[PDB]
Each structure stands twice: as structure tokens, then as C-alpha cells.
Design a protein around this ligand. Structure first.
Ligand code: 9H6
Ligand code: ZN
Lengths: 47, 162
């Protein structure tokens, strides 16, 4: 794995083109996330 | 060590997690190529993931981060799609869950858009789609996502052409 930039703990990627997209995030230590909910689902065909 | 507790659809906690799934769907610039074409999900089951060891691993690091960031963990709830969801819930995130070809380096990636994480349930770029039909837009096969608790601490802001 890589490291977060010095003095940081993560990276926030903000969309500068698509105004409708939300942020994506990166961490570099697995102990900084907990997998709290497991969601089972189907995608739905548009009507 | 991992226990999975089914939530009832009548439980308030089920309903708020479903609404986070549903309200963060968006259209993607690939036209649905990687994740499928949809505006919303059929949510079949929501389970709470309980593992004392993994949880104490999380809260121990959260306190270190918080103390290096003016007492602010900067904790979010974020989605994560992966073929390795089953390994993740029993063993936790580690460096084998890091995306080498990721846009911000070799780390573990999360999304606020559920439909973004949906693009990775069958692999990078949707892989070859579902195991049964090889269909990245399969409306039949059941999929799984993780809704995760994530400590960001001091976060480096990257303005990506996304
Ligand atoms: C190690 N490995 C990975 O890490 C992924 C799965 C998880 N991946 C991921 N990437 C993103 C988002 C997300 O939920 N999951 C949302 C935000 C944007 C990017 C990255 C790729 C993978 C697929 C196939 C084989 C190996 C791997
Ligand atoms: Zn299928």
C-alpha cells in the first residue's frame, strides 16, 4: 500500500466536471474502516 | 468471530440504511456499462456486521487519528463494493483490499454514491458481470454491498476531473 500525504489520514476526491457526482475517498490503513452493514440487493430495470 | 444480525424491514435502522442506498443512486458517464442501467434498487436484506476484535481495531485507530486532528475523527458512512465482501466481513480491510490502479494511489476506496460502489461488485469496471449470466446489468442475480464506518481524519483534497 501507499501512504496518505504527509500530515494527512486520507484523500478526498471531488468531482470538478460532473456537478451531480458525489465524493470518493481513499484510506491507506485497513483499521480506518469497519464493514458495518452488509446489504443484499438487485438493481431494478427502469420502467 | 463475525456474527451477522438480520434487520427487520420494520426496523428504523433497516429503513435509514435502505434510504442511504436509494438516495445516492446517480447516472454514470459510462451509460451503465460497468454497473448496469437502473434508477433504484430492490433491497432484499440488510445485516449488521458484529465482530468485537475488528471493531476494537477500528476504534483504537479512530482515537489515534482523532488526537492527531484537533480531536476530530472525521468519521463518515461510505459504500464499498468488492468481489471480496465475504473476506472483508470476517477478516477486515487490509492491504489485499487496496486498488493499485486507483486514481489516488494504492489505497482502499469508498463512495458516497451507492451506484459508484455498485460498479465494483463484480470487479474492476464491472468485470464480466454476474457469474451466472456474464451480465454487468443483470436484474436477476443478487448483489452485495458494504455500508462502512470510515475514519478520514485530516483529508487531502484532490480536485479530479470526475
Ligand atoms: C483489490 N481490489 C479492489 O480494491 C477492487 C474492488 C474494490 N474497489 C473499489 N473501487 C472503488 C469504489 C469501491 O467501492 N470499490 C468506489 C469508489 C471508486 C473506486 C477497487 C477495485 C477490485 C476489483 C477486482 C479485483 C481486485 C480488486
Ligand atoms: Zn445474473
Amino acid at each position: 500500500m501507499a501512504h496518505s500525504p504527509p500530515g494527512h489520514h486520507s484523500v478526498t476526491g471531488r468531482p470538478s466536471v460532473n456537478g451531480l457526482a458525489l465524493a470518493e475517498y481513499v484510506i491507506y490503513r485497513g483499521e480506518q474502516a469497519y464493514p458495518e452493514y452488509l446489504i443484499t440487493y438487485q438493481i431494478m430495470r427502469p420502467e | 468471530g463475525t456474527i451477522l444480525i438480520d434487520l427487520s424491514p420494520d426496523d428504523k435502522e433497516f429503513q435509514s440504511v435502505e434510504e442511504e442506498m436509494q438516495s445516492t443512486v446517480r447516472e454514470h458517464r459510462d451509460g451503465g456499462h460497468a454497473g448496469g442501467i437502473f434508477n433504484r434498487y430492490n433491497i432484499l436484506k440488510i445485516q449488521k456486521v458484529c465482530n468485537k476484535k475488528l471493531w476494537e481495531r477500528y476504534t483504537h485507530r479512530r482515537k489515534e487519528v482523532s488526537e492527531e486532528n484537533h480531536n476530530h475523527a472525521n468519521e463518515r458512512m461510505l459504500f464499498h463494493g468488492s468481489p471480496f465482501v465475504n473476506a472483508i466481513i470476517h477478516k477486515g480491510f487490509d492491504e489485499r483490499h487496496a486498488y493499485i490502479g486507483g486514481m489516488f494511489g494504492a489505497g482502499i476506496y469508498f463512495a458516497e454514491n451507492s451506484s459508484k460502489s455498485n460498479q465494483y461488485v463484480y470487479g474492476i469496471g464491472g468485470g464480466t458481470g454476474c457469474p451466472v449470466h456474464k451480465d454487468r446489468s443483470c436484474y436477476i442475480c443478487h448483489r452485495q454491498l458494504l455500508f462502512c464506518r470510515v475514519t478520514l481524519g485530516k483529508s487531502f483534497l484532490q480536485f479530479s476531473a470526475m
